[PDB]
């Protein structure tokens, strides 16, 4: 009963990771992904950011911010976030590029969801296995990114504690929206 869980956002640094951590700690077989063309984040922001590729060791990123200005990048969480990540994976992966399969692909933004869906129908395989993609809005910022991680964990826990997600996954989503007053889009795809 140790299912495959993915958590996706655009750039793979905040929301999917903050949740990657929580689902990992509580034992879940989970991974994190991004859908963006590159990896972006704050930094003298609201005009000029920092960008990397989906292979840049998180550790390597941490390094750079230091020289640029290790001052700023502490206050704004940026650095702590990064160190917290060197400890989960090596570098942020791009979803569309993954060859790995899951059961619940959880996405954190309405647009990411769509961007995943698409790339999901973009194929077919002689395995034909079902995979639920639940999207759960969660604001893209240091704080709320942590709350979502709880919400998402509270959600994956509940669904994992079943045997047959498929014929009662729908029943469950219903139950959940009632506790969190959130909106959990859902959509079945096949590999």
Helix/strand/coil (H, E, C) string of the chain? CCCEEEEECCCCCCHHHHHHHHHHHCCCEEEEEECCCCEEECCCCCCCCEEECCCCCHHHHHHHHHHHHCCHHHHCCHHHHHHHHHCCCCCCCEHHHCCCCCCEEEECCHHHHHHHHHHHHCCCCCCCCEEEEEEECCCCCCCHHHHHHHHHHHHHHHHHCCCCCHHHHHHHHHHHHHHHCCCEECCEEEC
Q: Answer whether 54's CB lies under 8 Å from 94's CB.
A: yes
Two tokens, residue 155: 């959600």
Two tokens, residue 127: 């395995």
Cα torsion 30, 49, 145, 120: sign? negative
Two tokens, residue 11: 């750039």
Within this chain, do residues 109 and 157 fall inside the same structural domain, yes or no?
Answer: yes
Within this chain, do residues 86 and 104 fall inside the same structural domain, yes or no?
Answer: no
Contacts 24+ apart (CB under 8 A), 98-102: 98/31, 98/33, 100/6, 100/31, 101/4, 101/129, 101/131, 101/191, 102/3, 102/4, 102/5, 102/6, 102/31, 102/131
Instruction: Provide the β-strand partners of residue 4.
Output: 29
Cα torsion 142, 10, 5, 152: sign? positive
Experimentally, the structure was elucidated by X-ray
Within this chain, do residues 110 and 147 fall inside the same structural domain, yes or no?
Answer: yes
Radius of gyration of the chain (CA): 17
Structural resolution in Å: 3.2
Q: Which CATH number covers residue 30?
A: 3.40.50.2300
In whole angstroms, what is the distance from residue 63 CA to residue 182 CA? 38
In whole angstroms, what is the distance from residue 126 CA to residue 129 CA? 9
In whole angstroms, what is the distance from residue 85 CA to residue 175 CA? 33
Within this chain, do residues 83 and 9 fall inside the same structural domain, yes or no?
Answer: no
Instruction: Provide the β-strand partners of residue 166.
Output: none
Within this chain, do residues 61 and 5 fall inside the same structural domain, yes or no?
Answer: no
Domain that holds residue 50: 37-92
In whole angstroms, what is the distance from residue 20 CA to residue 7 CA? 7
In whole angstroms, what is the distance from residue 65 CA to residue 74 CA? 9
Give residue 128's region: left, alpha or beta (phi > 0; psi -120 to 50).
left
Within this chain, do residues 110 and 23 fall inside the same structural domain, yes or no?
Answer: yes
In whole angstroms, what is the distance from residue 149 CA to residue 106 CA? 11
Q: Which CATH number covers residue 58?
A: 6.10.140.550
Within this chain, do residues 121 and 29 fall inside the same structural domain, yes or no?
Answer: yes
Distances (CA, A) of 4 to 23, 61, 143: 11, 28, 26
In whole angstroms, what is the distance from residue 155 CA to residue 183 CA? 12
Within this chain, do residues 109 and 150 fall inside the same structural domain, yes or no?
Answer: yes
Within this chain, do residues 111 and 177 fall inside the same structural domain, yes or no?
Answer: yes
Domain count for the chain: 2
């Amino acid at each position: 009963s140790k299912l495959a869980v993915a958590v996706v956002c655009s750039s793979n640094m905040n929301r999917s990771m903050e949740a990657h951590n929580f689902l990992a700690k509580k034992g879940f077989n989970v991974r994190s992904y991004g859908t963006g063309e590159r990896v972006k984040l704050p930094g003298m922001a609201f005009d000029k950011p920092n960008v990397y590729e989906f292979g840049t060791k998180y550790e390597d990123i941490y390094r750079d911010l230091e020289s640029k200005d290790k001052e700023f990048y502490t206050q704004n969480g940026l650095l702590h976030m990064l160190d917290r990540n060197r400890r989960i994976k090596k570098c942020p992966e791009r979803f569309q590029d993954t060859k790995e399969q899951f059961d619940i692909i959880v996405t954190v933004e309405e647009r990411v969801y769509d961007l995943v869906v698409m790339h999901m129908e973009s194929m077919e395989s002689v395995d034909n296995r079902p995979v639920h993609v639940l999207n759960v809005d969660v604001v893209d910022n240091a704080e709320d990114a942590l709350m979502g991680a709880f919400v998402i964990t509270d959600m994956i826990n509940m669904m994992a504690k079943s045997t047959d997600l498929d014929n009662d996954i729908d029943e469950l989503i219903q139950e959940f929206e009632e506790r969190r007053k959130r909106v959990i889009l859902h959509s079945v795809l096949f590999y």
